Design an enzyme around this catalytic site. Structure first.
Site, short mmCIF file in Angstrom:
data_model
loop_
_atom_site.label_atom_id
_atom_site.label_comp_id
_atom_site.label_asym_id
_atom_site.label_seq_id
_atom_site.Cartn_x
_atom_site.Cartn_y
_atom_site.Cartn_z
CG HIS A 1 -1.70 1.31 1.42
ND1 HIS A 1 -2.62 1.80 0.56
CD2 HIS A 1 -1.62 2.22 2.49
CE1 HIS A 1 -3.10 2.97 1.06
NE2 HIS A 1 -2.48 3.23 2.22
CG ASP B 1 10.01 18.46 -25.32
OD1 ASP B 1 10.43 17.70 -24.41
OD2 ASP B 1 8.98 18.18 -26.00
CD1 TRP C 1 6.27 3.19 5.33
CD2 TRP C 1 7.48 4.14 3.67
NE1 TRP C 1 6.47 4.49 5.66
CE2 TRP C 1 7.17 5.12 4.71
CE3 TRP C 1 8.23 4.53 2.57
CZ2 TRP C 1 7.62 6.43 4.64
CZ3 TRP C 1 8.66 5.86 2.49
CH2 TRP C 1 8.37 6.79 3.50
CB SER D 1 12.69 6.84 -12.33
OG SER D 1 11.75 7.48 -13.17
CB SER D 2 12.98 10.27 -8.92
OG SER D 2 11.70 9.68 -9.06
CG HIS E 1 11.35 15.08 7.24
ND1 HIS E 1 10.32 14.90 8.12
CD2 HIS E 1 11.10 16.27 6.58
CE1 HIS E 1 9.52 15.95 8.05
NE2 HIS E 1 9.99 16.77 7.08
CD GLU F 1 9.50 10.45 -1.15
OE1 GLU F 1 8.53 10.04 -1.80
OE2 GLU F 1 10.50 10.95 -1.72
CE1 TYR G 1 7.74 19.28 5.29
CE2 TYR G 1 9.64 17.87 5.72
CZ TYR G 1 8.55 18.62 6.19
OH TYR G 1 8.28 18.69 7.58
CB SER H 1 0.17 28.94 -5.38
OG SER H 1 0.70 28.69 -4.12
CG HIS I 1 11.02 14.33 13.27
ND1 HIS I 1 11.17 15.50 12.61
CD2 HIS I 1 10.37 13.47 12.38
CE1 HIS I 1 10.67 15.39 11.37
NE2 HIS I 1 10.21 14.13 11.22
CG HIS I 2 10.82 9.88 10.91
ND1 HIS I 2 9.57 9.50 10.61
CD2 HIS I 2 11.04 11.08 10.24
CE1 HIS I 2 9.03 10.41 9.76
NE2 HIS I 2 9.94 11.36 9.54
CB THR J 1 4.29 25.56 7.03
OG1 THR J 1 5.46 24.73 6.95
CG2 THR J 1 3.18 24.86 6.40
CE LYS K 1 3.76 27.12 -0.08
NZ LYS K 1 4.13 28.15 -1.09
NE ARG L 1 2.83 3.38 11.43
CZ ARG L 1 3.57 4.19 10.68
NH1 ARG L 1 4.10 5.26 11.27
NH2 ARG L 1 3.77 3.93 9.37
C1 HEA Z 1 2.87 15.23 2.86
C2 HEA Z 1 3.49 14.53 3.78
C3 HEA Z 1 3.79 15.04 5.14
C4 HEA Z 1 3.94 16.36 5.56
C5 HEA Z 1 3.82 17.59 4.69
C6 HEA Z 1 4.23 16.27 6.91
C7 HEA Z 1 4.43 17.40 7.76
C8 HEA Z 1 4.89 17.41 9.13
N1 HEA Z 1 4.98 16.35 9.93
FE1 HEA Z 1 4.73 14.37 9.28
N2 HEA Z 1 4.56 12.33 8.58
C9 HEA Z 1 4.32 11.91 7.31
C10 HEA Z 1 3.92 12.78 6.24
C11 HEA Z 1 4.00 14.24 6.26
N3 HEA Z 1 4.13 15.00 7.37
C12 HEA Z 1 4.40 10.51 7.17
C13 HEA Z 1 4.09 9.68 5.94
C14 HEA Z 1 4.84 10.08 8.42
C15 HEA Z 1 5.06 8.67 8.90
C16 HEA Z 1 6.32 7.93 8.44
C17 HEA Z 1 6.17 6.56 9.03
O1 HEA Z 1 6.59 6.32 10.20
O2 HEA Z 1 5.58 5.74 8.30
C18 HEA Z 1 4.99 11.24 9.22
C19 HEA Z 1 5.45 11.32 10.57
C20 HEA Z 1 5.81 12.51 11.34
C21 HEA Z 1 6.44 12.43 12.60
C22 HEA Z 1 6.88 11.14 13.29
C23 HEA Z 1 6.15 10.67 14.56
C24 HEA Z 1 6.41 9.18 14.87
O3 HEA Z 1 6.58 8.45 13.90
O4 HEA Z 1 6.45 8.64 16.01
C25 HEA Z 1 6.59 13.75 13.00
C26 HEA Z 1 7.17 14.29 14.28
O5 HEA Z 1 8.06 15.15 14.39
C27 HEA Z 1 6.00 14.53 12.00
C28 HEA Z 1 5.88 15.96 12.16
C29 HEA Z 1 5.51 16.80 11.07
C30 HEA Z 1 5.62 18.17 11.09
C31 HEA Z 1 6.11 19.05 12.21
C32 HEA Z 1 5.22 18.57 9.84
C33 HEA Z 1 5.16 20.01 9.38
O6 HEA Z 1 5.83 20.18 8.10
C34 HEA Z 1 3.77 20.62 9.25
C35 HEA Z 1 3.83 22.15 9.11
C36 HEA Z 1 2.45 22.76 8.94
C37 HEA Z 1 1.68 23.31 9.93
C38 HEA Z 1 2.10 23.38 11.38
C39 HEA Z 1 0.31 23.86 9.53
C40 HEA Z 1 0.24 25.20 8.80
C41 HEA Z 1 0.75 26.34 9.67
C42 HEA Z 1 0.09 27.33 10.29
C43 HEA Z 1 -1.40 27.49 10.21
C44 HEA Z 1 0.93 28.30 11.09
C45 HEA Z 1 0.68 28.34 12.60
C46 HEA Z 1 1.10 27.08 13.34
C47 HEA Z 1 1.68 27.03 14.55
C48 HEA Z 1 1.99 28.30 15.28
C49 HEA Z 1 2.06 25.72 15.19
N4 HEA Z 1 5.41 13.78 11.07
C1 HEA Z 2 0.11 8.73 -0.75
C2 HEA Z 2 0.11 8.03 0.39
C3 HEA Z 2 -1.08 7.28 0.95
C4 HEA Z 2 -2.40 7.32 0.57
C5 HEA Z 2 -3.05 8.08 -0.55
C6 HEA Z 2 -3.06 6.45 1.46
C7 HEA Z 2 -4.46 6.17 1.28
C8 HEA Z 2 -5.11 5.35 2.25
N1 HEA Z 2 -4.56 4.71 3.29
FE1 HEA Z 2 -2.58 4.66 3.80
N2 HEA Z 2 -0.58 4.57 4.32
C9 HEA Z 2 0.43 5.18 3.73
C10 HEA Z 2 0.20 6.12 2.68
C11 HEA Z 2 -1.07 6.41 2.06
N3 HEA Z 2 -2.26 5.86 2.35
C12 HEA Z 2 1.70 4.91 4.30
C13 HEA Z 2 3.02 5.49 3.91
C14 HEA Z 2 1.49 4.01 5.32
C15 HEA Z 2 2.51 3.40 6.28
C16 HEA Z 2 2.65 1.88 6.06
C17 HEA Z 2 3.71 1.23 6.89
O1 HEA Z 2 3.56 1.13 8.13
O2 HEA Z 2 4.72 0.81 6.29
C18 HEA Z 2 0.08 3.85 5.27
C19 HEA Z 2 -0.59 3.03 6.23
C20 HEA Z 2 -2.03 2.98 6.24
C21 HEA Z 2 -2.70 2.27 7.25
C22 HEA Z 2 -1.90 1.62 8.36
C23 HEA Z 2 -2.45 0.31 8.82
C24 HEA Z 2 -1.54 -0.43 9.73
O3 HEA Z 2 -0.65 0.29 10.24
O4 HEA Z 2 -1.76 -1.69 9.88
C25 HEA Z 2 -4.07 2.38 6.97
C26 HEA Z 2 -5.27 1.84 7.68
O5 HEA Z 2 -6.44 2.26 7.59
C27 HEA Z 2 -4.14 3.13 5.79
C28 HEA Z 2 -5.43 3.38 5.16
C29 HEA Z 2 -5.58 4.11 3.92
C30 HEA Z 2 -6.80 4.36 3.27
C31 HEA Z 2 -8.18 3.86 3.63
C32 HEA Z 2 -6.47 5.16 2.18
C33 HEA Z 2 -7.26 5.75 1.06
O6 HEA Z 2 -8.19 4.76 0.47
C34 HEA Z 2 -7.83 7.14 1.36
C35 HEA Z 2 -8.73 7.58 0.21
C36 HEA Z 2 -7.83 7.94 -0.96
C37 HEA Z 2 -7.81 7.29 -2.13
C38 HEA Z 2 -8.72 6.12 -2.30
C39 HEA Z 2 -6.84 7.75 -3.19
C40 HEA Z 2 -7.49 8.23 -4.47
C41 HEA Z 2 -6.50 8.69 -5.51
C42 HEA Z 2 -6.53 8.30 -6.80
C43 HEA Z 2 -7.64 7.37 -7.18
C44 HEA Z 2 -5.53 8.82 -7.80
C45 HEA Z 2 -6.14 9.10 -9.18
C46 HEA Z 2 -5.68 10.35 -9.90
C47 HEA Z 2 -6.07 10.63 -11.18
C48 HEA Z 2 -6.98 9.76 -12.02
C49 HEA Z 2 -5.58 11.87 -11.86
N4 HEA Z 2 -2.90 3.47 5.32
#
Ligand code: HEA
Ligand code: HEA
Ligand SMILES: CCCCCCCCCCCCCCCCCC(=O)OCC(COC(=O)CCCCCCCCCCCCCCCCC)OC(=O)CCCCCCCCCCCCCCCCC
Ligand SMILES: CCCCC/C=C\C/C=C/C/C=C\C/C=C\CCCC(=O)O[C@H](COC(=O)CCCCCCCCCCCCCCCCC)COP(=O)(O)OCCN
Ligand SMILES: CCCCCCCCCCO[C@@H]1O[C@H](CO)[C@@H](O[C@H]2O[C@H](CO)[C@@H](O)[C@H](O)[C@H]2O)[C@H](O)[C@H]1O
Lengths: 79, 43, 49, 46, 105, 144, 259, 227, 98, 73, 84, 514, 58
Positions: free
Chosen positions: L61, L91, L126, L156-157, L240, L242, L244, L255, L290-291, L316, L319, L438
């Site tokens: 997934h 291009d 993952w 690729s990327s 991390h 990744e 962003y 935007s 922090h992970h 953030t 924006k 989890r």
């Molecule tokens: C699009 C993907 C995405 C983005 C953008 C972010 C954004 C952020 N995430 Fe997240 N995060 C994930 C995807 C993402 N995360 C995923 C996939 C994991 C799990 C990996 C795994 O274990 O599988 C994860 C896990 C993760 C952890 C790990 C916790 C744990 O595993 O035990 C932490 C902790 O530091 C973290 C923190 C943050 C923070 C601080 C931001 C910040 O960048 C957010 C900044 C934005 C705001 C705060 C809101 C807008 C701001 C305002 C309105 C201004 C005013 C706000 C204040 C004054 C506070 N995230």
């Molecule tokens: C992009 C990242 C992404 C997205 C979209 C999602 C989508 C969803 N995920 Fe996600 N999830 C992860 C990233 C994401 N997940 C990651 C990184 C983990 C951690 C796994 C690990 O521990 O290793 C995770 C783990 C995770 C768990 C953890 C379970 C466990 O820990 O045992 C669960 C459980 O409910 C969950 C549920 C769902 C559901 C219901 C949706 C969705 O069904 C929500 C609804 C959204 C959609 C259905 C997507 C629709 C988009 C399209 C159809 C694209 C089409 C575009 C065009 C045609 C132009 N996900």
């Protein structure tokens, strides 16, 4: 004298979450001391504090594996 | 944004069909696997 | 000439809502889904020893 | 000199809506189906 | 950046340019609707006179519509604005959107 | 009057609040009587009729402001169609339950929960706010 | 037809054959690691060699023979190379991190010291040092090559190139011989692991780099380069220097400091 | 342990955990503040016919939207850090216990005086006594003296696991060849539960932790009996 | 001898590279490599915009430092004006290829 | 009949924002304050109240008689 | 140090070639010399069956699965000891 | 013709089209994968009866959603389509290498599926942490297959990043400076930078995981004096950034959309938007640990990482506020794309806010490895990244294709999705606070109600996906041809009509110096 | 050697409609077909392996 032992005290050489070196140092320190006190003879109860500390802190499987390897001739620590 | 009228209008009937087929293409094969889950277990 | 929503809007809103509420409620309460709500003020405790 | 214009810049044909339909349905459907069949596949390895 | 009274006079000057052309007319009005304000009658009057010189009735009417539009939920603005332009409207033969029936769907 | 896909690099007509005077007129070609009317425009606008004034407006613009801002009944359709497909989803869940999920574990049977609730209260689960704090030990019943 | 200065590239099979050969190689490696068969690998390797040959041949045809490499086009190539090099730096970093992580906090299972108990490192004053002189020397001769080319001297260019190439080969042979002679292996704990993998990948790059040089030699023999337009050559020199510097870093970290 | 339909944290059983609860209330208060604010303004922006579509000046307002968050961030970090240095602070423990992860169970060692160790395995559902909890019970609980500082040393004999007891505020990964220290104190006697918190394979979901918190007196007799 | 043997661009440059080179020598920019310099862009002094067809896209950075460029089709004929700043542009035909 | 008085015609949009920003701050605050009185302070009191009376030995003893422990019967 | 020699008023390829033959190559000949007279017997180290070395968690996928790619009987023992 | 055009392409539009196609398809697979997850969790007990398979489904997934749906759609898909169009490029810098960027994907993807088909699949999460991911606990081909898939996806990327940077720096009109370029173009460039720097570190780590598995190295193996913590450093060093990478092109499109449908000629605070993107990029590289708050790093390191993580909220914040400011005073058109954009701004804020909660090492002790995390990140991915995808796809669809979507249908779609995702992920915060781990195939009975409601919302989302397909078909079936687009004077990409011809900018734009 | 660039310049600019990778003549063709043959060959082979490897061999 002075033992009064409950468990290993805090030991500012190993102040962090990671306590591996603490178990290890004490194992070493115990056995160096044992060495000294046997290429002279008699009592090892001078070394006894080291035995008590690493006994408390090392997992058993670590201590037995190390023990094997000393006997085997494969223990990698300088004693 | 503006556009020409459809070159080939899709009527309500036609939409009804397109819709029904799309769903079934998603639902059936999974419904199938799911329905038989048990015929796969105990091994 | 009135649009699709002028003609049908009110029927679609009406049956849509109806059909939705009916079936969820049916589904929520009638097919043996276990929700396991908080037992507090619900269940009379019993001797387990 | 390639074909240019709506319906000409895609690798599939939209000349017939019913053929387009069967196509999309195989395409998206195969994708949705696979994890169901992988899971199956794995349960029958047994 | 300038005061109210400078801004007003500036736009009046703009729409009074004797040989203002159609492009200039549209540019002026299209710019003007960009601002946080409903424009002073003196300016509208200028702009409608400009319509008259360009022999363009329909634009005069379209100008009236935007005045009303830019007032949004302040229903008092538009009737005031017409009250003030009433001699120019009568002098020039310009009808209001409401007079023409263009305010109904 | 007709717009062509290949006129894309030529200025277009648009009806927008914030662009009240578009770049071209709505109607570009005039019939005989329409020319005669544009001639009358060169004269006093008092002389024009109301029908004639509406005409001139229509040659220039497609929709009036009142027209271009009309509200609609679309939201109804949208809300009702959404609820319909949402109601529809419940069918899938009804199916799933019936044909896919098997019996849940015996720890959900009522006798099991009653005994388990009790044990939980004996071991005083969340005694400060969550669970046990809600039980009256003296009166041996849930707090009212 | 165009009034910009950029190259519109003929449709080409090579992206697709490269991608396929990537599949074959990784398939093959898998096959090799788990089923003891090498066929897929051989296939992947062949087709990959063939794709590389033809793609770069067409680049040549496009520029030396068809003149598509306008200054705008060349500016782009300068960036792509630099970037590609940057990405190679980050890659090696990962292996440097691993080395430094292990060697600074030596675990108990190694006897808590670095180098570990039972490991006998090579003497950095012997062949590692000579290796170091051989790469540093080639850095010089390649620069002599470049100035010769720019001043339009065919003979000396060729002579300097040859010398740089011979030094590279020398390095490669000394390095093979060291590998054979070393009293530790890749399976000798994290010492062997970090040592053989970092110097390994580096050794791989000295090869790639040497190859690139030979290609420039031949294009030069064949008069492809002007005294003003010779990007194939500048690319190869940058890459060479990159190779050089990584070596310095290995030598300071692993051979010297880590000994 | 958790009860049905719970929303927040399990009740605190330790000081540190109580401390985190109030900290979280602090933080969550700020979360509501900020998101309600954003919500309100979004709808303020969308609910008027009035327009202003020509260009606007950035300078003045960008300050407010930089300085405010920075202040807020400091109000959050200040207490957060205090608590972190506290979860660390100089202990004086009366006892050391080791726990070792295995696929899939936990074993425990109490080696300060004697050489005591045992394995703790989940009770299968087919063997629960009535009143017992599904996937939470163990045959052998970790008997600790209540009201005292204990050093828990955590590690693994195979893959990664993670030893957690939420109501005590405890979570420490179990890493082979590594000895991680955490510090444990209960304010109350009782039974407190946790679950392996690092994916360790196909039975991840089934290797729970159950602590039995009792008075020193009982704890001693119990340990002598487990030799 | 420390003689030659290396060709020069003048001898060996071909196709488009060669065109760009020659053109530059006569100070001409048929392949649009340099930024044209605004005139005063009034009605008497328009910005003249070379082209091989009857239309080209202009971008007008109305004032220096603007983050936003105004884009539009310039057509053969009378001069046209940037819908944003008013400055004038006129298309001028071929003469990169008569 | 009689003329209409001249109204406000400039900065309507800005007028509206001045007003509502204040609203938005207060509303935003209220929410926060609500959470603080109704949850947070409540929680400190719960804990405070609870431990004051608390007797761990009597707690234990109750648990002992209810038969929950492996180590204590 | 940021030199020991000097240049800039006349040059090019000539200068760099001067450095190739004048400094670069001679250093190589030195380091080569230094190595001629340091080659020979690496006193084969005694074998101890240490558990952190001669690692095998999977057979290598060539030969008998137990030899490393650049195996050298003279200096590289197997997990059971040096070879016959 | 077909082969030359579709298999041998060197055209940025067609290639972008291939990415859109590849991405949609992978999307269907990821969805199915998510529905398996939620079927298993939907009632207490076991559904699949095999937990290794659950672990596999969860692992696939995440790999599918991240490497095969988001990145190809956002970067490969919109990036190729829109970047040259927005800068007047004829291009991309390297058209041919571009095509190889795409073709490496299906083989990469093939390997991922294969890994789940041989032996018992790769049930590692993952993050692929060893020793569980190593040759004892995961013996045989599955993990190795996964590694190679990441290798090809990585290359690729990497090549793509290089192509995007080169093209963006070197192919603007001579008069235009980087400070005149659209924000989507910035957002891609910055993303390309992060790809360039971070992927090779991943690549190195998984290479070390490979050799420990197959060459008897002991990088992560205590027996040989190696260390598993070292693997987490490298992974999260890439990991991390990744995240962003996944959101930046989203910011870029939001935007454009917010501006466009606000009837504005430019976004509020263009230069502050640039600033904010760059700062996120930078900070995004110094916060990876922090992970790792639970692995036993020292308290000072932990205090540094909490503090550096917090700082990202500031750029953030700017924006978010600038988007709000762009709406201020707009002539709002309630288009379907606009509705995605509004939802994004709000839902992402919530997701970002729960991130802040996680940043505190103190709390994260209790929150790490629970559903609270899963809740957080599905807010930022499934209502972040996805909502921008849906927004961008409905806005630019007519430009890609020449046809119009039915707006009412699109609005019905949005509504349904909105309810489904909230009902799925909202309850999961409570699951985390109450402490559900989890990655679990079953749960203690207390946790039932939330899990039930969650799985229930997941079906509602499926109904949206299904409707989306029908909606795309309806447009191609009815064939409503676009005539006029608004606001082209500030939206260069529309100027060549719909769809634009095979070669655009054969004669480049004219832009004065002044 | 001697300078034959002009000659190759003429051949490759020759206005025959062929893409750059085929303008060498017959050799290009052979080489291209071989590559293509091995690529599709190899891929087919791997599908076969993937398949075969996906079932346990007891
Ligand atoms: C699009 C993907 C995405 C983005 C953008 C972010 C954004 C952020 N995430 Fe997240 N995060 C994930 C995807 C993402 N995360 C995923 C996939 C994991 C799990 C990996 C795994 O274990 O599988 C994860 C896990 C993760 C952890 C790990 C916790 C744990 O595993 O035990 C932490 C902790 O530091 C973290 C923190 C943050 C923070 C601080 C931001 C910040 O960048 C957010 C900044 C934005 C705001 C705060 C809101 C807008 C701001 C305002 C309105 C201004 C005013 C706000 C204040 C004054 C506070 N995230
Ligand atoms: C992009 C990242 C992404 C997205 C979209 C999602 C989508 C969803 N995920 Fe996600 N999830 C992860 C990233 C994401 N997940 C990651 C990184 C983990 C951690 C796994 C690990 O521990 O290793 C995770 C783990 C995770 C768990 C953890 C379970 C466990 O820990 O045992 C669960 C459980 O409910 C969950 C549920 C769902 C559901 C219901 C949706 C969705 O069904 C929500 C609804 C959204 C959609 C259905 C997507 C629709 C988009 C399209 C159809 C694209 C089409 C575009 C065009 C045609 C132009 N996900
Ligand atoms: C995003 C939209 C959500 C919609 C999703 C649909 C799915 C259904 C869910 C429908 C749910 C409706 C949403 C209400 C919010 C409740 C928050 C809460 O209970 O918080 C309390 C704590 C729990 O801590 C405690 O331990 C104290 C408990 C209180 C004592 C009484 C206990 C008995 C129950 C009392 C009932 C209270 C009401 C809750 C009842 C339970 C609800 C299920 O939980 C937590 O942290 C939860 C973590 C959430 C963090 C994300 C913040 C999101 C901001 C949203 C914007 C606000 C603008 C509103 C704007 C209004 C918009 C509508
Ligand atoms: C003179 C230097 C040239 C060396 C290269 C030649 C050999 C073919 C391999 C090419 C791959 C290049 C190197 C990368 C792999 C690591 C090899 C490390 C270098 C090395 O060769 O180390 C040797 C071990 O070789 C061994 O296992 C050999 C096993 C070879 C199998 C390679 C497995 C493929 C792994 C690479 C794939 C990873 C992907 C890389 C790029 C992906 C990023 C996008 C040392 O020999 P030894 O007997 O242990 O000790 C000496 C005892 N007297
Ligand atoms: C997460 C994804 C959600 C999936 C939701 C599935 C919704 C239901 C779709 C229909 O699925 C079909 O349902 C039938 C059950 O009604 C099955 O027939 C089965 O049962 C029938 C009647 O009971 C018999 O006719 C058939 O022989 C027998 O195969 C059939 O195979 C299955 O495909």
């Amino acid at each position: 004298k002075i033992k009064n032992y409950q468990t290993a005290p805090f030991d500012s050489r190993f102040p962090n979450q990671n306590q591996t070196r603490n178990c290890w140092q004490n194992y070493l320190d115990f056995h160096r001391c044992e060495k000294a006190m046997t290429a002279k003879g008699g009592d090892v109860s001078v070394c006894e504090w080291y035995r008590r500390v690493y006994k408390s802190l090392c997992p058993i499987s670590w201590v037995s594996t190390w023990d094997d390897r000393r006997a085997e001739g494969t223990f990698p620590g300088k004693i | 944004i503006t556009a020409k009228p459809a070159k080939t209008p899709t009527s309500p009937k036609e939409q009804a069909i397109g819709l029904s087929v799309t769903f079934l293409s998603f639902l059936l094969p999974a419904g199938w696997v799911l329905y038989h889950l048990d015929n796969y277990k105990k091994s | 000439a009135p649009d699709f929503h002028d003609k049908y809007g009110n029927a679609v809103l009406a049956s849509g809502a109806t059909f939705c509420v009916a079936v969820w409620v049916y589904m929520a309460t009638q097919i043996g889904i276990e929700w396991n709500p908080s037992p507090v003020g619900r269940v009379t405790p019993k001797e387990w020893r | 000199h390639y074909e240019e214009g709506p319906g000409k810049n895609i690798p599939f044909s939209v000349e017939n809506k019913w053929r387009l339909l069967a196509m999309m349905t195989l395409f998206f459907g195969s994708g949705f189906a696979a994890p169901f069949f992988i899971v199956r596949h794995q349960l029958l390895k047994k | 950046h300038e005061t109210d009274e400078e801004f007003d006079a500036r736009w009046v000057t703009y729409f009074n340019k004797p040989d203002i052309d159609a492009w200039e007319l549209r540019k002026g009005m299209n710019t003007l609707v960009g601002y946080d304000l409903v424009p002073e009658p003196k300016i509208i009057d200028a702009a409608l006179r400009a319509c008259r010189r360009l022999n363009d009735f329909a634009s005069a009417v379209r100008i009236l519509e935007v005045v009303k539009d830019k007032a949004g939920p302040h229903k008092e603005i538009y009737p005031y604005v017409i009250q003030e332009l009433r001699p120019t409207l009568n002098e020039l033969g310009i009808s209001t959107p409401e007079e023409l029936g263009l305010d109904k769907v | 009057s007709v717009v062509k896909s290949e006129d894309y690099a030529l200025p277009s007509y648009v009806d927008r609040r914030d662009y009240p005077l578009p770049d071209v007129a709505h109607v570009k070609n005039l019939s005989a009587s329409q020319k005669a009317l544009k001639e009358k425009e060169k004269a006093s606008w008092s002389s024009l009729s109301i029908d004639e004034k509406v005409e001139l407006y229509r040659l220039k613009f497609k929709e009036s402001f009142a027209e271009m801002n009309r509200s609609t009944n679309e939201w109804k359709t949208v809300v009702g169609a959404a609820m319909f497909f949402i109601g529809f989803t419940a069918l899938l869940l009804i199916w799933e339950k019936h044909y896919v999920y098997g019996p849940i574990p015996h720890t959900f049977e009522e006798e099991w929960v009653a005994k388990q609730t009790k044990r939980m209260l004996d071991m005083k689960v969340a005694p400060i706010q969550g669970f046990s704090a809600k039980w009256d030990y003296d009166k041996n019943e849930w707090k009212k | 037809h165009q009034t910009h200065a950029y190259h519109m590239v003929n449709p080409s099979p090579w992206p697709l054959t490269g991608a396929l050969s990537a599949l074959l190689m990784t398939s093959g490696l898998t096959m090799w690691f788990h089923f003891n068969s090498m066929t897929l690998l051989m296939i992947g390797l062949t087709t990959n060699m063939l794709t590389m040959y033809q793609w770069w041949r067409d680049v040549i045809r496009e520029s030396t023979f068809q003149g598509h490499h306008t200054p705008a086009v060349q500016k782009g190539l300068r960036y792509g190379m630099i970037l590609f090099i940057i990405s190679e730096v980050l890659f090696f970093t990962g292996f440097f991190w691993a080395f430094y992580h292990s060697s600074l906090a030596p675990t108990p299972e190694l006897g808590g010291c670095w180098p570990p108990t039972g490991i006998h490192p090579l003497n950095p004053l012997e062949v590692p040092l000579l290796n170091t002189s051989v790469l540093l020397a080639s850095g010089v001769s390649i620069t002599w090559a470049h100035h010769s080319l720019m001043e339009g001297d065919r003979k000396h260019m060729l002579q300097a190139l040859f010398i740089t190439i011979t030094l590279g080969v020398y390095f490669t042979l000394l390095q093979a011989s060291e590998y054979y002679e070393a009293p530790f292996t890749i399976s000798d704990g994290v010492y062997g692991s970090t040592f053989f993998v970092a110097t390994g990948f580096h050794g791989l790059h000295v090869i790639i780099g040497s190859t690139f040089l030979i290609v420039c030699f031949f294009r030069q023999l064949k008069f492809h380069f002007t005294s003003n337009h010779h990007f194939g050559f500048e690319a190869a020199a940058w890459y060479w220097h990159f190779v050089d510097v990584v070596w310095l870093f290995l030598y300071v970290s692993i051979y010297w400091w880590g000994s | 342990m958790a009860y049905p339909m719970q929303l927040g944290f399990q009740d605190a059983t330790s000081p540190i955990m109580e401390e985190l609860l109030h900290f979280h209330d602090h933080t969550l208060m700020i979360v509501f503040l900020i998101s309600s604010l954003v919500l309100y303004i979004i709808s303020l922006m969308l609910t008027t016919k009035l327009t202003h579509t020509s260009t606007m000046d950035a300078q003045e307002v960008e300050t407010i939207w930089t300085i405010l968050p920075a202040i807020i961030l400091i109000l959050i970090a200040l207490p957060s850090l205090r608590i972190l240095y506290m979860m660390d602070e100089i202990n004086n423990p009366s006892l050391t216990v080791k726990t070792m992860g295995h696929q899939w169970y936990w074993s425990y060692e109490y080696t300060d005086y004697e050489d005591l160790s045992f394995d703790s395995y989940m009770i299968p559902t087919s063997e629960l006594k009535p009143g017992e909890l599904r996937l939470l019970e163990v045959d052998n609980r970790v008997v600790l003296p209540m009201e005292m500082t204990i050093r828990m040393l955590v590690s693994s004999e195979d893959v990664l696991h993670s030893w957690a007891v939420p109501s005590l505020g405890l979570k420490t990964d179990a890493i082979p060849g590594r000895l991680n220290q955490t510090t444990l104190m209960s304010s109350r006697p009782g039974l407190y539960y946790g679950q392996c918190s690092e994916i360790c394979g196909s039975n991840h979901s089934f290797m729970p932790i159950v602590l039995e918190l009792v008075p020193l007196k009982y704890f001693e007799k119990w340990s002598a009996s487990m030799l | 001898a420390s003689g030659g043997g290396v060709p020069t661009d003048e001898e060996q440059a071909t196709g488009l590279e060669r065109e760009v080179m020659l053109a530059a020598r006569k100070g001409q920019d048929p392949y649009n490599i340099l930024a044209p310099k605004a005139t005063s862009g009034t009605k008497e002094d328009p910005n003249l915009v070379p082209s091989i067809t009857n239309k080209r896209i202009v971008g007008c950075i109305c004032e220096e430092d603007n983050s936003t460029v105004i884009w539009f089709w310039l057509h053969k004929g009378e001069a046209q004006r940037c819908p944003s700043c008013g400055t004038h542009y006129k298309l001028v035909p071929h003469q990169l290829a008569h | 009949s009689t003329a209409l008085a001249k109204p406000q015609m400039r900065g309507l949009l800005a007028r509206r924002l001045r007003f509502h920003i204040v609203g938005a701050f207060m509303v935003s605050l209220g929410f926060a304050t609500f959470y603080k009185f109704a949850v947070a302070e409540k929680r400190k009191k719960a804990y405070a109240d609870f431990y004051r009376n608390y007797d761990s030995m009597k707690d234990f003893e109750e648990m002992r008689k209810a038969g929950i422990f492996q180590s204590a019967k | 140090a940021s030199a020991a020699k000097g240049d800039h008023g006349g040059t090019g390829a000539r200068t760099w070639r001067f450095l190739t033959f004048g400094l670069a190559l001679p250093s190589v000949a030195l380091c080569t010399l230094n190595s001629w007279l340091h080659s020979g017997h690496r006193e084969r180290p005694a074998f101890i069956p240490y558990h952190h070395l001669r690692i095998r968690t999977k057979p290598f996928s060539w030969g008998d699965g137990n030899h490393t790619f650049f195996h050298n009987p003279r200096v590289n023992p197997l997990p059971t000891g040096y070879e016959k | 013709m077909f082969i030359n055009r579709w298999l041998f392409s060197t055209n940025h539009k067609d290639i972008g089209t291939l990415y859109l196609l590849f991405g949609a398809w992978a999307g269907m697979v990821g969805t199915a994968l998510s529905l398996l997850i939620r079927a298993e969790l939907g009632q207490p007990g076991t559904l699949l009866g095999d937990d290794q398979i659950y672990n596999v489904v969860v692992t696939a997934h995440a790999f599918v959603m991240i490497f095969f749906m988001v990145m190809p759609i956002m970067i490969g898909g919109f990036g190729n389509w829109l970047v040259p169009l927005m800068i007047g490029a004829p291009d991309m810098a390297f058209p041919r290498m571009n095509n190889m960027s795409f073709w490496l994907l299906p083989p990469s993807f093939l390997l991922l599926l294969a890994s789940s088909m041989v032996e018992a699949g790769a049930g590692t999460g993952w993050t692929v942490y060893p020793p569980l991911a190593g040759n004892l606990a995961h013996a045989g081909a599955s993990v190795d297959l996964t590694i190679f898939s990441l290798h090809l996806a990585g290359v690729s990327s990497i090549l793509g990043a290089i192509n995007f940077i080169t093209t963006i720096i070197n192919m603007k009109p001579p008069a235009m400076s980087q400070y005149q370029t659209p924000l989507f173009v910035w957002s891609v460039m910055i993303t390309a930078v992060l790809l360039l720097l971070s992927l090779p570190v991943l690549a190195a780590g998984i290479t070390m995981l490979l050799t420990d598995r197959n060459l008897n190295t002991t990088f992560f193996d205590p027996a040989g004096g190696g260390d598993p913590i070292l693997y987490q450093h490298l992974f999260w060093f890439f990991g991390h950034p990744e995240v962003y990478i996944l959101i930046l092109p989203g910011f870029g499109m939001i935007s454009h959309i917010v501006t466009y449908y606000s009837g504005k000629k430019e976004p509020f605070g263009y230069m502050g938007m640039v600033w904010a993107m760059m700062s996120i990029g930078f900070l995004g590289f110094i916060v990876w640990a922090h992970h790792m708050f639970t692995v036993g790093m020292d308290v000072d390191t932990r205090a540094y990482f909490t503090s550096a993580t917090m700082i990202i909220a500031i750029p953030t914040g700017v924006k978010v506020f600038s988007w709000l400011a762009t709406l201020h005073g707009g002539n709002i058109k309630w288009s379907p794309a606009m509705m995605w954009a509004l939802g994004f701004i709000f839902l992402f804020t919530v997701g970002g806010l729960t991130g802040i909660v996680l940043a505190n090492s103190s709390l994260d002790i209790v929150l790490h490895d629970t559903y609270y995390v899963v809740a957080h990140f599905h807010y930022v991915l499934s209502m972040g990244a996805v909502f921008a995808i849906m927004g961008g796809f409905v806005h630019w669809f007519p430009l890609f294709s020449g046809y119009t979507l039915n707006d009412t249908w699109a609005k019905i779609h949005f509504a349904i999705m909105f309810v489904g995702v909230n009902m799925t992920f909202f309850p999961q915060h409570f699951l985390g606070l109450s402490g559900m781990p989890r990655r679990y195939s079953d749960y203690p009975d207390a946790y039932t109600m939330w899990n039930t409601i969650s799985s229930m919302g997941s079906f509602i989302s499926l109904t949206a996906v299904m409707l989306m397909v029908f909606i795309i078909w309806e447009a191609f079936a009815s064939k409503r041809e676009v005539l006029t687009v608004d606001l082209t004077t500030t939206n260069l990409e529309w100027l060549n009509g719909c769809p634009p011809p095979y070669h655009t900018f054969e004669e480049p734009t004219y832009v004065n110096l002044k | 050697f001697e300078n034959r660039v002009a000659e190759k310049q003429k051949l490759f600019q020759e206005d025959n409609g062929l893409p750059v990778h085929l303008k060498g003549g017959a050799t290009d063709n052979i080489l291209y077909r071989v590559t293509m043959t091995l690529c599709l060959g190899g891929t087919l082979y791997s599908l076969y392996c993937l398949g075969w490897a996906s079932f346990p061999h007891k």
